[PDB]
Amino acid sequence: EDKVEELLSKVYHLENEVARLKKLIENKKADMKQLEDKVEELLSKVYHLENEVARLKKLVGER
Amino acid sequence: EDKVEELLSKVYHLENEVARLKKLIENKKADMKQLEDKVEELLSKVYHLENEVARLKKLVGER
Amino acid sequence: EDKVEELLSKVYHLENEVARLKKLIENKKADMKQLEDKVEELLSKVYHLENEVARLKKLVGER
Prior knowledge:
Chains A, B, C: Residues 1-63 form the bZIP domain. Three copies of one chain form a homotrimer. By secondary structure, the first copy, chain A, is mainly alpha-helical.
C-alpha cells in the first residue's frame, strides 16, 4: 500500500485502541472508588471492634 | 525530515507507547482483582469477629 | 483538508490523548499502592483482634 493509506489505517487503529483503553481506565477508576469505600467502611468496623474488645477487657479485668 | 517520514515515526512511537500503557492497565486490573479478593475476605473476617464479640457480650451479660 | 495535514492533526490529537491517559494510569497506580497499604494494615488489625478475642474466650472459658 502507499504510505498515505498506510498511515491513515495505522492512525485509525490507534484511535480505536486509545478509545478502548480510555474506557478500561475509566472502569478501573470506578472500581477503585468502590473499593476505597469498602476499605473506609472496614476501617470503621475494625475500630468499632477494637473499642468493643477494650470494653470487654475492662469488664472482665483483663489487662 | 519530510512529513511522511515524520508521520511514520510519530505513529510508530504512538504504537509503542499505547502497547506499554495497555500492559500497565492490564497489570493494574489484575492487581485490583487480587485486592478485591482480600477486601472480600476481610469483610468476612470482620463479620465473624462481630459475631464472636456479640456472643462474648451475651456470655458476660454486657448490653 | 489535504491528507498530510489531516494526518498531522490526528497524530497530535493522539499524542495529547495518550499523554492524558498515561497520567491517569500513573495516578490509578499510586492510588492502588496506598489502598494496598491500608488493606495490609487492616489484615494486621484483624489478626490482632482475632488473637484478643481468642484470649478473652480462654479467660471466660468459652469454647
